[PDB]
């Protein structure tokens, strides 16, 4: 009785390496209306 062993073979193939990064969403043009005069 020889040792019987489950054996898998390896094969070369391409693999991609994605990542995941958190972050906010800032707008493209966000102006802000500050006045330039003095009054009501």
């Amino acid at each position: 009785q020889t040792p019987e062993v489950g054996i898998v073979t390896l094969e070369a193939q391409t693999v991609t390496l994605n990542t995941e990064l958190p972050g906010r969403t800032n707008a493209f043009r966000i102006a802000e209306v500050r006045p330039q005069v003095n009054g009501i």
Binding site: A27, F28, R29, I30, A31, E32
Partner: protein
């Protein structure tokens, strides 16, 4: 030909140089309206955008 005095030539030349200084004041102020980068290198991101 000295049809006008040297005194009121030196006054006019002083007025010309003083007005040229007062217009190059406005010329460098227009140079300050546009923003020139003071040194060279990797610029980051804009802190304020168009219209702010």
């Amino acid at each position: 030909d000295q049809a006008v005095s040297k005194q009121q030539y030196a006054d006019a030349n002083a007025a010309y140089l003083q007005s040229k200084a007062a217009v190059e004041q406005a010329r460098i102020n227009l140079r300050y309206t546009k923003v020139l980068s003071p040194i060279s290198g990797r610029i980051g991101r804009s802190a304020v955008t168009e219209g702010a």
